[PDB]
């Protein structure tokens, strides 16, 4: 939520760059769905970056 409200208010281009670590328990599913990549692409598409 903080990332979204920052990107929409235009204040993102002047913040200090961040590092964030996303962990998700092991992937041994029959599927190749990965919710890290999906969540970050949803963040980048909701804000149109």
């Amino acid at each position: 939520g903080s990332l979204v409200c920052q990107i929409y208010s235009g204040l993102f281009n002047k913040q200090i760059s961040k590092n964030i670590l996303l962990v998700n328990p092991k992937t041994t599913s029959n599927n190749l769905v990965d919710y890290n990549v999906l969540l970050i692409q949803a963040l980048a598409g909701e804000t149109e970056m």
Binding site: C5, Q6, S9, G10, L11
Partner: protein, 50 residues
């Protein structure tokens, strides 16, 4: 008595010198007020709500 007379003269001429530049310093103070509104945390809260 004499040195405070010279000080009184410099004080009167300081009155004049302060008043002759009063429009310039007036616009300067207005600009200072203007650009002071736009670096608070209040303006940041407004930007995030918008």
């Amino acid at each position: 008595p004499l040195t405070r007379a010279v000080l009184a003269v410099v004080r009167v001429r300081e009155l004049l010198r302060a008043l002759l530049l009063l429009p310039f310093s007036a616009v300067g103070g207005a600009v200072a007020a203007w650009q002071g509104l736009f670096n608070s945390q209040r303006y940041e809260n407004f930007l995030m709500s918008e």
